[PDB]
Design a binder for this molecule. Structure first.
Ligand code: NAG
Lengths: 49, 49
């Protein structure tokens, strides 16, 4: 409350080689006291140049 | 299914903290300063009975 959820993820698990370009980032904020599962596939624009 | 044991004489086993691993090399493309095809693998741990 009065905030979010923050996280750092190690990119070496992806081994970004052998044809790798785009990657989707799905979400699933399930609001408590509501059976409401509103997702959001945001920033499906993260890139590797 | 996969298993690992340890004996020596008259089949007398020995107890030890085994640390087995199971990996694969996709295309032996010779390192390129990022491991010689060290591609993703689940390692394991446990004690021998
Ligand atoms: C692998 O383990 C299962 C355990 O239920 C067994 O049924 C199966 O026969 C095993 N594989 C071989 C080749 O024996």
């Amino acid at each position: 409350s009065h905030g979010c959820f923050y996280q750092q993820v190690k990119t070496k698990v992806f081994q970004l080689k052998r044809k790798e370009y785009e990657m989707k980032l799905h979400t699933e904020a399930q609001i408590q006291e509501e059976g409401t599962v509103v997702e959001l596939t945001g920033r499906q624009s993260s890139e590797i140049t | 299914n996969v298993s690992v044991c340890g004996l020596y004489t008259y089949g007398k086993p020995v107890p030890g903290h085994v640390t087995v691993s199971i990996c694969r090399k996709y295309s032996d493309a010779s390192d390129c300063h990022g491991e010689d095809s060290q591609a993703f693998c689940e390692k394991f741990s446990g004690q021998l009975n």
